[PDB]
Design a protein around this motif. Structure first.
Motif, PDB file in Angstrom:
ATOM      1  N   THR A 169      -6.328   1.422   7.016  1.00 24.71           N
ATOM      2  CA  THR A 169      -6.092   2.610   6.442  1.00 24.71           C
ATOM      3  C   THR A 169      -7.476   3.574   6.507  1.00 24.71           C
ATOM      4  OG1 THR A 169      -6.583   1.801   4.041  1.00 24.71           O
ATOM      5  CG2 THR A 169      -4.195   1.937   4.866  1.00 24.71           C
ATOM      6  N   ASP A 205       0.826  -1.193  -0.110  1.00 20.73           N
ATOM      7  CA  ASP A 205       0.161  -0.021  -0.013  1.00 20.73           C
ATOM      8  C   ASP A 205       0.952   1.161  -0.090  1.00 20.73           C
ATOM      9  OD1 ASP A 205      -1.938  -2.205   0.228  1.00 20.73           O
ATOM     10  OD2 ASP A 205      -2.980  -1.139   2.002  1.00 20.73           O
ATOM     11  N   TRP A 261      -8.287  -6.849   2.987  1.00 18.29           N
ATOM     12  CA  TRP A 261      -7.813  -6.029   1.824  1.00 18.29           C
ATOM     13  C   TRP A 261      -9.053  -5.816   0.870  1.00 18.29           C
ATOM     14  CZ3 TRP A 261      -4.771 -10.626   2.612  1.00 18.29           C
ATOM     15  CH2 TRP A 261      -5.568 -11.928   1.972  1.00 18.29           C
ATOM     16  N   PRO A 313       8.483  33.069  -4.820  1.00 16.70           N
ATOM     17  CA  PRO A 313       8.292  34.126  -3.589  1.00 16.70           C
ATOM     18  C   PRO A 313       9.227  35.025  -3.404  1.00 16.70           C
ATOM     19  CG  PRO A 313       9.457  31.971  -2.952  1.00 16.70           C
ATOM     20  CD  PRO A 313       9.136  31.974  -4.617  1.00 16.70           C
ATOM     21  N   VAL A 314       9.974  35.716  -4.486  1.00 26.87           N
ATOM     22  CA  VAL A 314      10.896  36.667  -4.506  1.00 26.87           C
ATOM     23  C   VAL A 314      11.728  36.673  -3.375  1.00 26.87           C
ATOM     24  CG1 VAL A 314       9.602  38.095  -6.259  1.00 26.87           C
ATOM     25  CG2 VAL A 314       9.143  38.328  -3.748  1.00 26.87           C
ATOM     26  N   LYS A 315      12.565  35.531  -3.144  1.00 30.00           N
ATOM     27  CA  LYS A 315      13.568  35.437  -2.092  1.00 30.00           C
ATOM     28  C   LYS A 315      14.932  36.095  -2.482  1.00 30.00           C
ATOM     29  CE  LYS A 315      10.959  33.874   1.072  1.00 30.00           C
ATOM     30  NZ  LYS A 315       9.917  32.846   0.691  1.00 30.00           N
ATOM     31  N   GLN A 331       0.510  36.670  -8.326  1.00 28.45           N
ATOM     32  CA  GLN A 331       1.710  37.390  -8.837  1.00 28.45           C
ATOM     33  C   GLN A 331       1.573  37.836 -10.383  1.00 28.45           C
ATOM     34  OE1 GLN A 331       5.095  35.074  -7.878  1.00 28.45           O
ATOM     35  NE2 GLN A 331       4.715  35.164  -5.629  1.00 28.45           N
ATOM     36  N   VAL A 367       0.763  14.112  -1.449  1.00 30.56           N
ATOM     37  CA  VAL A 367       1.727  15.118  -2.232  1.00 30.56           C
ATOM     38  C   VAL A 367       0.948  14.809  -3.681  1.00 30.56           C
ATOM     39  CG1 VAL A 367       3.721  15.496  -3.518  1.00 30.56           C
ATOM     40  CG2 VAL A 367       3.770  14.534  -1.155  1.00 30.56           C
ATOM     41  N   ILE A 368       0.379  15.915  -4.131  1.00 30.82           N
ATOM     42  CA  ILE A 368      -0.266  15.842  -5.405  1.00 30.82           C
ATOM     43  C   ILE A 368       0.649  16.088  -6.457  1.00 30.82           C
ATOM     44  CG2 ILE A 368      -2.503  16.907  -4.832  1.00 30.82           C
ATOM     45  CD1 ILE A 368      -1.873  19.598  -4.607  1.00 30.82           C
ATOM     46  N   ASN A 369       0.511  15.720  -7.767  1.00 23.87           N
ATOM     47  CA  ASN A 369       1.249  15.717  -8.800  1.00 23.87           C
ATOM     48  C   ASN A 369       1.383  17.121  -9.289  1.00 23.87           C
ATOM     49  OD1 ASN A 369       2.209  12.550 -10.089  1.00 23.87           O
ATOM     50  ND2 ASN A 369       0.315  12.805  -8.900  1.00 23.87           N
ATOM     51  N   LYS A 370       2.284  17.514  -9.970  1.00 24.40           N
ATOM     52  CA  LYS A 370       2.625  18.974 -10.614  1.00 24.40           C
ATOM     53  C   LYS A 370       1.928  19.114 -11.889  1.00 24.40           C
ATOM     54  CE  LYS A 370       6.081  21.398 -10.005  1.00 24.40           C
ATOM     55  NZ  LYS A 370       7.609  22.073  -9.738  1.00 24.40           N
ATOM     56  N   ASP A 371       0.902  17.995 -12.142  1.00 22.97           N
ATOM     57  CA  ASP A 371      -0.131  18.188 -13.364  1.00 22.97           C
ATOM     58  C   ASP A 371      -1.578  17.922 -13.078  1.00 22.97           C
ATOM     59  OD1 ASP A 371      -0.403  15.509 -13.102  1.00 22.97           O
ATOM     60  OD2 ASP A 371       1.363  15.026 -14.562  1.00 22.97           O
ATOM     61  N   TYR A 412       5.322   7.744  -7.443  1.00 13.85           N
ATOM     62  CA  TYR A 412       6.905   8.184  -6.908  1.00 13.85           C
ATOM     63  C   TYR A 412       7.663   6.900  -6.863  1.00 13.85           C
ATOM     64  CZ  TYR A 412       5.395  13.031  -6.698  1.00 13.85           C
ATOM     65  OH  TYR A 412       4.753  14.246  -6.954  1.00 13.85           O
ATOM     66  N   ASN A 469      -3.730   8.246  -0.899  1.00 17.44           N
ATOM     67  CA  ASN A 469      -2.439   8.295  -0.227  1.00 17.44           C
ATOM     68  C   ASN A 469      -2.194   9.064   1.163  1.00 17.44           C
ATOM     69  OD1 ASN A 469       0.203   8.724  -3.178  1.00 17.44           O
ATOM     70  ND2 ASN A 469      -1.662   7.126  -2.792  1.00 17.44           N
ATOM     71  N   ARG A 493      -3.955   6.837   3.738  1.00 19.59           N
ATOM     72  CA  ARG A 493      -3.165   5.388   3.951  1.00 19.59           C
ATOM     73  C   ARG A 493      -1.991   5.839   4.888  1.00 19.59           C
ATOM     74  NH1 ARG A 493      -2.760   2.386  -1.908  1.00 19.59           N
ATOM     75  NH2 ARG A 493      -4.377   0.771  -1.502  1.00 19.59           N
ATOM     76  N   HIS A 494      -1.092   6.897   4.550  1.00 20.73           N
ATOM     77  CA  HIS A 494       0.111   7.378   5.175  1.00 20.73           C
ATOM     78  C   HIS A 494       0.184   8.779   5.767  1.00 20.73           C
ATOM     79  CE1 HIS A 494       0.230   5.271   1.704  1.00 20.73           C
ATOM     80  NE2 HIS A 494       1.042   4.204   2.227  1.00 20.73           N
ATOM     81  N   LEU A 505      -7.356  -1.868  -3.924  1.00 20.34           N
ATOM     82  CA  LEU A 505      -7.548  -3.127  -2.998  1.00 20.34           C
ATOM     83  C   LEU A 505      -6.773  -2.690  -1.704  1.00 20.34           C
ATOM     84  CD1 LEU A 505      -6.390  -5.046  -5.819  1.00 20.34           C
ATOM     85  CD2 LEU A 505      -7.671  -6.561  -4.665  1.00 20.34           C
ATOM     86  N   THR A 506      -7.718  -2.049  -0.923  1.00 20.24           N
ATOM     87  CA  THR A 506      -6.946  -1.375   0.360  1.00 20.24           C
ATOM     88  C   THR A 506      -7.365  -2.072   1.580  1.00 20.24           C
ATOM     89  OG1 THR A 506      -7.100   0.789   1.348  1.00 20.24           O
ATOM     90  CG2 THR A 506      -9.067   0.008   0.331  1.00 20.24           C
ATOM     91  N   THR A 507      -6.621  -1.823   2.578  1.00 18.98           N
ATOM     92  CA  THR A 507      -6.708  -2.516   4.055  1.00 18.98           C
ATOM     93  C   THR A 507      -7.730  -1.585   4.790  1.00 18.98           C
ATOM     94  OG1 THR A 507      -4.782  -1.229   4.958  1.00 18.98           O
ATOM     95  CG2 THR A 507      -4.394  -3.425   4.027  1.00 18.98           C
ATOM     96  N   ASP A 555       7.312  16.486 -13.686  1.00 20.77           N
ATOM     97  CA  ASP A 555       5.904  16.769 -13.584  1.00 20.77           C
ATOM     98  C   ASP A 555       5.663  16.034 -11.927  1.00 20.77           C
ATOM     99  OD1 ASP A 555       6.599  14.271 -14.464  1.00 20.77           O
ATOM    100  OD2 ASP A 555       4.799  14.032 -15.570  1.00 20.77           O
ATOM    101  N   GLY A 590      11.156  37.821   1.525  1.00 21.47           N
ATOM    102  CA  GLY A 590      10.046  37.810   0.738  1.00 21.47           C
ATOM    103  C   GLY A 590       9.616  39.197   0.049  1.00 21.47           C
TER     104      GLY A 590
END
Lengths: 63, 194, 339, 95, 194
Positions: free
Chosen positions: E22, B54, E6, B114-116, E112, E73-77, B59, E65, E68-69, E17-19, B77, E139
């Protein structure tokens, strides 16, 4: 080792070792070192420009 | 099962067909525990036998990339933070270290959204101005030269006739981590404050 | 466990050191030999005022040719002055803030600046083009680096916080020769002219002389009970003056392994913040952190002179390599040259 | 492993009784050997007994520990009987 | 839900298929109720024996995600908004709050792009000047320094001698607001205007 109060033994061991040759090293009388310092200072008093009135021409600080 | 020439890790329920010796890279990895045989598992597909783990499959892409191909190059991405967090789960210190280095490199090379920035002022007399302006540091950007008047020698050729002001796209605040506060640093800071 | 036996062994070894020091402790001829004429009244004049700083000046350090000093002002800027013409050869914008130490290279082609960022910046004074470029960002210090002096052009120690002083290989950029053993944030660091022994003063008030090859504390001078601010070796490398928050500057000697002489005023409460020896080493310039500095006779402990004229504390002193003038990096944002 | 480097605990629990019993037994064994039989065959017998006992102690105990045990065993066996051997019943060193 | 720890879901046609553990991390979760038997639940697929959650699996990934944990973290797309909207359907409050913070952090960084910059003016005499220039708030950015002649403490060393403009980019990091209906605020605004 960590059961002898978590590796506190090593620092004392190192202290003893480092004190050994500090006991071993040559010892000199205070008067001798003092006299050596005076000899060097008096020998170099002339060439220390602070001790001597600096003429208006020789230094880059009245130039 | 416990040992196979290739193993189908159902990461996120998705098959990753990986060979043993690549998983054999680091003993403290979870993957090493999968390779060795000492039954404490009951989790797998109840129709194939593929080990259901799980965890995120997305990633694990970069994780297995580093694992099987030595060096890590992440997909641009996928946010590097997920790569670090998933590497935490499979417990590979070298890849974690390199990912932290990559995060710091990314923030240093790009944290100007963030303009650092860092700013400094460098007073300079008009005469040596061209010298230190031309020989100004590599990586620093000149921002503004500001005249300062005086009543000295008809107002000109004073030791302070200008204030150069430069900047720096880098910053000393954490790129992910930096120098953290300590009591003696605070002591020296307030000592200099007065 | 074994803590008690080693503690007793260290106690008896330390007592042996004490007994050896006191046994070889003869009368210091210096104050006794006052038949030698005193240094009299000598007062230096400010020939040059290097008013090119707005922020407070923390560290000043004369160059190897004693014409090109490097000063660091706390905002984060390095100024390599030309003291013969009062013209800045460079003015480096430092990423570091709160810089306390700037050191000049033996070649006079590098400068080491240290702040609270835990990074020893090694800036190239001259690159192939002619601009000032950072040679190396020596990173990997546990705490802030308080003082540093070049052992070589690829060797330098960094008296840093958290009891460390490790020598760094500048070429590779990793610390090479560890010097742990201190119990305080090692603030001071003085190199002898021999450069094979460096004495480091920390907040534990113990000046640890370290052998720079083997890397163990060659000697462990004590006698201060307040954090050691600055240490200045005698021009010979056999003795050093030590300052601290007490108004007593202790002239220690390596041969006797103990303090020879004191420079203390009960009429002054300001801590000795900077110590420096002249060309002959006969003058002990006592930098006081009130607004001005004094200078003692390093052999009589009487008032050789007083250099005053700063309206804020002199935070560091420096002497030319011919001893012919003394610069005072003070907190009034001036570097005054006294000939 | 409970000591993890700790010699003192193991020596107190096991090594000291082992040392004492071995010393006493080999001492009386050397004495009765010297009493019963001549010098050379006595030397051969003590050496053979040493071989057998050393092999068994080898498998029984770890190498790092046995060396002090064997040295004291030999010191009890030979050094204590230094003077008797030179002039001994039947045949001695002078013989 | 009383069989197959499961447990297999058909979220958006995807067999997850998840426990049970979670999902039972946060009972406030729609799925926590599916971990247990209840008689109103009559949503099922009889082609795979797996129950139906007619929500897309494209945003179910990060939600599962996190759940479960304890972190996502969301994808950059992939849209943070989509993860959020899939999030309330299972009613995990902490996850939704954290995703709201992430969304507003991102939108602050994209406000911005519209021409939106916050400007401030500070006043400084020559001595203190660089001290704020160096230790200025992280900043922001330096934009302008103007020396204005003085007769009160003539010229240099006067407090009103130098004016330093600074600026950053407009942000809505914890949230943005266009009005506060509280009357007393309006009264004070009118008073402080003149």
């Amino acid at each position: 080792m960590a059961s002898n109060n978590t590796a506190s033994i090593a620092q004392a061991r190192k202290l003893v070792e480092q004190l050994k040759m500090e006991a071993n090293i040559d010892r000199i009388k205070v008067s001798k070192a003092a006299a050596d310092l005076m000899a060097y200072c008096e020998a170099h008093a002339k060439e220390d420009p602070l001790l001597t009135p600096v003429p208006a021409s020789e230094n880059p600080f009245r130039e | 099962g416990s040992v196979s020439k290739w193993v189908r890790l159902n990461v996120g329920g998705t098959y990753f067909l990986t060979t043993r010796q690549t998983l054999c890279r680091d003993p403290k990895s979870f993957l090493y525990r999968l390779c060795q045989a000492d039954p404490d598992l009951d989790s797998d597909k109840d129709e194939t036998g593929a080990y259901l783990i799980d965890r995120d499959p997305t990633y694990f892409g970069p994780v297995l990339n580093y694992l099987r191909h030595g060096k890590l190059v992440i997909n641009k991405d996928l946010a590097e933070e997920g790569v670090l967090e998933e590497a935490e789960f499979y417990n590979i210190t070298s890849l974690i270290k390199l990912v932290k280095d990559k995060i710091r490199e990314r923030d240093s090379k790009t944290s100007q959204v963030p303009v650092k920035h860092v700013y400094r002022v460098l007073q300079c007399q008009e005469e040596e101005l061209t010298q230190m302006v031309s020989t100004m540091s590599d990586g620093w950007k000149f921002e503004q030269l500001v005249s300062i008047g005086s009543s000295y020698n008809y107002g000109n050729e004073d030791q302070a006739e200008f204030l150069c002001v430069v900047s720096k796209e880098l910053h000393n605040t954490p790129y992910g981590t930096a120098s953290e506060p300590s009591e003696k640093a605070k002591i020296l800071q307030e000592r200099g404050s007065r | 466990s074994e803590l008690d036996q080693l503690r007793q062994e260290a106690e008896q070894l330390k007592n042996q050191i004490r007994d050896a020091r006191k046994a070889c402790a003869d009368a210091t001829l210096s104050q006794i030999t006052n038949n030698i004429d005193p240094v009299g009244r000598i007062q230096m004049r400010t020939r040059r005022t290097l008013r090119g700083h707005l922020a407070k000046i923390y560290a000043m350090h004369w160059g190897t040719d004693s014409r090109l000093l490097v000063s660091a002002s706390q905002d984060g800027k390095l100024i390599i002055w030309d003291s013969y013409t009062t013209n800045k050869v460079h003015a480096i914008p430092l990423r570091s803030s709160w810089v306390m130490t700037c050191a000049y290279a033996p070649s006079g082609n590098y400068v080491a600046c240290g702040g609270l960022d835990n990074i020893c910046s090694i800036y190239n004074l001259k690159t192939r083009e002619g601009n000032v470029r950072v040679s190396r960002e020596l990173a990997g210090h546990t705490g802030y680096l308080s003082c540093c002096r070049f052992l070589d052009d690829n060797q330098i120690v960094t008296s840093s916080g958290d009891t460390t002083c490790a020598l760094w290989d500048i070429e590779t950029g990793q610390q090479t020769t560890t010097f742990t053993g201190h119990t305080g944030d090692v603030m001071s660091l003085s190199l002898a002219p021999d450069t094979r022994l460096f004495v480091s003063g920390a907040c534990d008030a113990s000046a640890k002389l370290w052998d720079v090859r083997e890397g163990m504390c060659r000697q462990t001078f004590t006698g201060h009970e307040s954090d050691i601010n600055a240490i200045c070796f005698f021009p010979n490398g056999n003795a050093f003056a030590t300052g601290s928050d007490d108004a007593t500057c202790r002239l220690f000697d390596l041969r006797a392994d103990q303090e020879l002489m004191t420079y203390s005023h009960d009429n002054i409460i300001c801590g000795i913040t900077s110590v420096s020896f002249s060309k002959s080493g006969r003058l002990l310039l006592a930098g006081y952190d009130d607004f001005n500095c004094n200078v003692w006779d390093a052999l009589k402990a009487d008032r050789a002179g007083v250099l005053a004229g700063h309206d804020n504390r002199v935070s560091c002193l420096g002497v030319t390599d011919d001893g012919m003038a003394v610069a005072t990096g003070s907190w009034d944002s001036f570097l005054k040259i006294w000939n | 492993i409970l000591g993890l480097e700790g010699r003192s605990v193991y020596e107190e629990d096991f090594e000291a009784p082992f040392l004492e019993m071995s010393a006493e037994f080999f001492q009386m064994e050397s004495q009765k050997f010297l009493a019963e039989n001549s010098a050379s065959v006595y030397i051969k017998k003590v050496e053979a007994r040493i071989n057998e006992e050393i092999e068994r102690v080898m498998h029984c105990l770890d190498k790092s520990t046995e060396e002090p045990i064997v040295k004291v065993v030999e010191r009890e066996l030979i050094s204590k009987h230094m003077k008797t051997i030179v002039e001994m019943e039947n045949s001695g060193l002078v013989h």
